[PDB]
Amino acid sequence: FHKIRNEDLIFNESLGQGTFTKIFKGVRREVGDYGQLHETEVLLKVLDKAHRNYSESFFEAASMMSKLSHKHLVLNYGVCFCGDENILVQEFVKFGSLDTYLKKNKNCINILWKLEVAKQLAAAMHFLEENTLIHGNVCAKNILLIREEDRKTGNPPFIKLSDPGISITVLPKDILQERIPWVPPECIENPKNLNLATDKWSFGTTLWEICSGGDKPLSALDSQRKLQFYEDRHQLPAPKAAELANLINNCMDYEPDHRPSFRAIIRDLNSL
Numbered sequence: 001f002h003k004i005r006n007e008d009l010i011f012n013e014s015l016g017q018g019t020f021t022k023i024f025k026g027v028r029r030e031v032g033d034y035g036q037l038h039e040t041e042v043l044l045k046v047l048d049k050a051h052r053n054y055s056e057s058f059f060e061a062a063s064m065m066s067k068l069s070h071k072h073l074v075l076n077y078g079v080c081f082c083g084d085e086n087i088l089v090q091e092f093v094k095f096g097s098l099d100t101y102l103k104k105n106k107n108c109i110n111i112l113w114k115l116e117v118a119k120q121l122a123a124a125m126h127f128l129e130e131n132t133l134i135h136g137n138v139c140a141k142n143i144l145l146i147r148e149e150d151r152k153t154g155n156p157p158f159i160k161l162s163d164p165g166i167s168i169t170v171l172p173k174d175i176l177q178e179r180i181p182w183v184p185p186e187c188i189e190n191p192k193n194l195n196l197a198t199d200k201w202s203f204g205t206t207l208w209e210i211c212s213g214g215d216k217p218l219s220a221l222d223s224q225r226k227l228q229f230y231e232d233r234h235q236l237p238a239p240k241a242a243e244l245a246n247l248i249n250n251c252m253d254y255e256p257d258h259r260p261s262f263r264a265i266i267r268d269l270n271s272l
């Protein structure tokens, strides 16, 4: 990872949190194209000091994906270790995460907008699958909205998938249970079951988020009830905008071996 000088990074407002992390907006002073100096807005992910035991998984999460370049994958700028802190520096967007965007703009987002964003997420996932790279935490909170729909130019919305954060293979059981239904049943049985098939299930859950205006599936269920949901082999309810209901259920197949390839997912989205 590129090491960003302490003097070149400034912390601004708190934006939220991730698993064992605090997230901030920041500013980075950098030499850019043609030697032009820029003050670039950045997203700062800071690992909690109390959870330093996860530093390897925290950085490995961003490192493996940073080795790849794709139009729908987040840009990583580097790391900063100012005051012994573990800080990930990534690109910043004013529009925030997809989950909050869906909720704030629920009355203005139609089926074509949802289909476009689903195709883009499926494109990123197909790229990762072709590279045999497991993501392991596909969800709308981990997706950034780069550009809003622009009807004046006919430009569609544009998204990028960010890194998965600390791996479910090292997280406490209680966190994984809270993550149902993004975490598939086989990973609840054993987190060592993390596989490319995991991402097909989580993509199904993320598509449900996209179709539900930022509602969180099973948010009314506590962890014990979330376990019962899997025990009784339930399926998520069809979203009110049900055009993608069949695809969500086909992805969220209790048999990991039967989950369709991302190439088949793209062809299904293209046939809508």
Ligand SMILES: CC(C)CCN1c2nc(Nc3cc(F)c(O)c(F)c3)ncc2N(C)C(=O)C1(C)C
Pocket (backbone or CB within 6 Å): 015, 016, 017, 023, 043, 074, 090, 091, 092, 093, 094, 095, 096, 097, 141, 142, 143, 144, 162, 163
């Ligand atoms: C969940 C949230 C705290 C962080 C969401 N998030 C990001 N959010 C922003 N912008 C932003 C976020 C806001 F929360 C907000 O209020 C706002 F105005 C702007 N830019 C980039 C990313 N990147 C690189 C990322 O990995 C993810 C995790 C997808």
